[PDB]
Amino acid sequence: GSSGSSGRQRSLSTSGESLYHVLGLDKNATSDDIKKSYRKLALKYHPDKNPDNPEAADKFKEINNAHAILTDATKRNIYDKYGSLGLYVAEQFGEENVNTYFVSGPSSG
């Protein structure tokens, strides 16, 4: 909570690209698109299908995290508002903790 008047607004700082790319979708991609796609991208980049494969681990390792992050509102909002950094802080500190951290910056009123 602790919000009613301030209502911090979002800034168009982010470049544009996001996890969506990691898989092959766009900003106009619906959760369903992420889940469905994740499947095909998981069966092809399967660890068992590609034994002792360097590129396989890199890709798959990326898909899991990507989808795993997109398959969650809590984070989905963090990666959308903050991004990669937000996840870190919110990792140990906590989503609620990431509030005071950001809320307090070069911005005011």
UniProtKB/Swiss-Prot annotation:
Formation of the chaperone complex DNAJC5/HSC70 is not regulated by phosphorylation. Ser-13 phosphorylation induces an order-to-disorder transition triggering the interaction with Lys-61. This conformational switch modulates DNAJC5's cellular functions by reducing binding to syntaxin and synaptogamin without altering HSC70 interactions. Palmitoylated. Could be palmitoylated by DHHC3, DHHC7, DHHC15 and DHHC17. Palmitoylation occurs probably in the cysteine-rich domain and regulates DNAJC5 membrane attachment. It is found in: Cytoplasm, Cytosol; Membrane; Cytoplasmic vesicle, Secretory vesicle, Chromaffin granule membrane; Melanosome. It comes from the Eukaryota. The modification N6-acetyllysine is found at residue 59. Residues 16-85 form the J domain. The modification Phosphoserine is found at residues 11, 13, 15, 18. Coiled coil: none annotated. Disruption phenotype: Defective SNAP-25 function, which causes neurodegeneration by impairing SNARE-complex assembly. Changing residue 13 to D: Reduced interaction with SYT9, but no effect on the interaction with HSC70. Acts as a co-chaperone for the SNARE protein SNAP-25. Involved in the calcium-mediated control of a late stage of exocytosis. Acts as a general chaperone in regulated exocytosis. May have an important role in presynaptic function. May be involved in calcium-dependent neurotransmitter release at nerve endings. Homodimer. Interacts with the chaperone complex consisting of HSC70 and SGTA. Interacts with ZDHHC13 (via ANK repeats). Interacts with ZDHHC17 (via ANK repeats). Interacts with SYT1, SYT5 and SYT7, and with SYT9, forming a complex with SNAP25. The interaction with SYT9 is stimulated tenfold in presence of calcium. This is DnaJ homolog subfamily C member 5. The gene is Dnajc5. The chain holds residues 5 to 100 of 198 of the full protein.
